[PDB]
Design a protein around this nucleic acid. Structure first.
Length: 30
DNA sequence: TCATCCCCTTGGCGGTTAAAACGCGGGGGACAGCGCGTACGTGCGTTTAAGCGGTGCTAGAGCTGTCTACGACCAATTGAGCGGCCTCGGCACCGGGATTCTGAT
Protein backbone atom coordinates (compact mmCIF):
# COMPACT_ATOMS: atom_id res chain seq x y z
CA UNK A 1 0.00 0.00 0.00
CA UNK A 2 0.93 3.67 -0.33
CA UNK A 3 2.48 5.56 2.57
CA UNK A 4 3.31 9.27 2.69
CA UNK A 5 6.66 10.53 3.92
CA UNK A 6 6.79 12.55 7.17
CA UNK A 7 6.67 15.97 5.53
CA UNK A 8 4.34 15.85 2.53
CA UNK A 9 1.03 15.71 4.41
CA UNK A 10 2.25 18.53 6.66
CA UNK A 11 2.86 20.85 3.71
CA UNK A 12 -0.41 19.75 2.10
CA UNK A 13 -2.34 20.64 5.26
CA UNK A 14 -0.42 23.93 5.48
CA UNK A 15 -1.48 24.84 1.95
CA UNK A 16 -5.07 23.69 2.53
CA UNK A 17 -5.49 25.70 5.74
CA UNK A 18 -3.74 28.75 4.26
CA UNK A 19 -5.95 28.76 1.16
CA UNK A 20 -9.19 28.45 3.15
CA UNK A 21 -10.36 30.90 5.83
CA UNK A 22 -12.75 28.63 7.74
CA UNK A 23 -12.82 28.42 11.53
CA UNK A 24 -10.52 25.68 12.83
CA UNK A 25 -11.85 25.68 16.43
CA UNK A 26 -15.16 23.99 17.19
CA UNK A 27 -18.05 26.15 18.34
CA UNK A 28 -19.42 24.24 21.34
CA UNK A 29 -16.15 23.68 23.28
CA UNK A 30 -14.99 27.24 22.63
C1' DT B 1 25.88 126.21 9.45
C1' DC B 2 26.05 122.82 5.05
C1' DA B 3 55.37 110.37 0.38
C1' DT B 4 59.46 106.36 2.71
C1' DC B 5 60.31 104.00 7.40
C1' DC B 6 57.66 102.53 11.26
C1' DC B 7 54.48 101.04 16.08
C1' DC B 8 50.88 98.00 15.77
C1' DT B 9 46.27 96.41 15.45
C1' DT B 10 42.73 93.04 11.93
C1' DG B 11 43.35 88.69 8.78
C1' DG B 12 44.94 83.17 8.22
C1' DC B 13 48.87 79.56 9.54
C1' DG B 14 50.67 76.80 13.53
C1' DG B 15 49.95 73.83 18.70
C1' DT B 16 47.44 69.87 22.93
C1' DT B 17 43.18 67.35 24.56
C1' DA B 18 41.04 61.88 25.95
C1' DA B 19 40.12 56.59 23.69
C1' DA B 20 40.41 53.28 19.80
C1' DA B 21 41.84 50.89 14.49
C1' DC B 22 45.93 48.31 13.25
C1' DG B 23 49.49 44.79 14.92
C1' DC B 24 50.02 40.95 17.49
C1' DG B 25 49.45 36.74 21.07
C1' DG B 26 45.52 33.05 20.79
C1' DG B 27 41.88 30.07 22.01
C1' DG B 28 36.24 28.31 22.94
C1' DG B 29 33.37 26.89 20.23
C1' DA B 30 30.11 27.11 15.39
C1' DC B 31 30.21 24.18 11.52
C1' DA B 32 30.18 19.62 9.65
C1' DG B 33 30.46 14.79 10.67
C1' DC B 34 29.94 10.27 13.91
C1' DG B 35 27.10 8.16 16.27
C1' DC B 36 23.18 6.91 19.62
C1' DG B 37 17.88 7.53 20.41
C1' DT B 38 12.88 7.10 20.76
C1' DA B 39 7.63 9.63 19.74
C1' DC B 40 4.84 9.36 16.76
C1' DG B 41 3.69 9.40 10.89
C1' DT B 42 0.67 6.96 8.59
C1' DG B 43 -2.75 3.49 8.32
C1' DC B 44 -6.71 0.74 11.02
C1' DG B 45 -10.44 -0.10 14.31
C1' DT B 46 -13.51 1.63 17.32
C1' DT B 47 -16.39 5.03 19.75
C1' DT B 48 -18.61 9.52 20.49
C1' DA B 49 -19.98 14.48 21.12
C1' DA B 50 -20.59 18.22 17.70
C1' DG B 51 -24.01 19.33 13.58
C1' DC B 52 -28.43 20.00 11.73
C1' DG B 53 -33.19 20.31 12.73
C1' DG B 54 -36.46 21.09 15.48
C1' DT B 55 -39.25 21.89 20.02
C1' DG B 56 -40.60 24.07 24.08
C1' DC B 57 -39.68 28.06 28.04
C1' DT B 58 -38.61 32.40 29.71
C1' DA B 59 -36.65 37.03 30.67
C1' DG B 60 -34.81 41.79 29.89
C1' DA B 61 -33.32 45.71 26.85
C1' DG B 62 -35.79 48.82 23.10
C1' DC B 63 -38.77 52.02 23.24
C1' DT B 64 -42.40 55.09 25.23
C1' DG B 65 -44.25 58.72 29.01
C1' DT B 66 -43.40 61.24 33.86
C1' DC B 67 -41.05 63.57 37.14
C1' DT B 68 -36.80 65.82 38.71
C1' DA B 69 -32.16 68.37 40.60
C1' DC B 70 -27.60 69.05 40.00
C1' DG B 71 -25.43 71.29 35.78
C1' DA B 72 -24.53 76.32 33.32
C1' DC B 73 -24.33 80.86 33.57
C1' DC B 74 -24.29 85.46 36.58
C1' DA B 75 -22.51 89.21 40.31
C1' DA B 76 -19.57 89.50 44.73
C1' DT B 77 -15.77 87.39 47.63
C1' DT B 78 -11.31 85.57 48.62
C1' DG B 79 -7.11 82.83 49.21
C1' DA B 80 -2.01 80.69 48.39
C1' DG B 81 1.27 79.50 43.90
C1' DC B 82 4.38 81.92 40.84
C1' DG B 83 7.92 84.65 40.46
C1' DG B 84 11.32 86.07 43.03
C1' DC B 85 14.58 86.27 47.21
C1' DC B 86 17.06 84.34 50.70
C1' DT B 87 19.05 79.78 53.32
C1' DC B 88 21.04 75.59 53.52
C1' DG B 89 23.24 71.08 52.71
C1' DG B 90 24.27 65.67 49.89
C1' DC B 91 27.14 63.70 47.57
C1' DA B 92 30.57 63.61 42.98
C1' DC B 93 35.18 63.97 42.92
C1' DC B 94 40.13 63.14 45.50
C1' DG B 95 43.19 59.56 47.70
C1' DG B 96 43.90 56.11 50.70
C1' DG B 97 42.66 51.90 53.23
C1' DA B 98 40.36 47.55 53.05
C1' DT B 99 38.34 43.81 50.09
C1' DT B 100 38.24 40.36 46.05
C1' DC B 101 37.73 36.95 41.74
C1' DT B 102 41.14 34.96 38.57
C1' DG B 103 44.98 33.11 36.34
C1' DA B 104 49.33 30.62 37.07
C1' DT B 105 51.74 27.13 40.37
Amino acid sequence: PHRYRPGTVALREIRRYQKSTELLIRKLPF
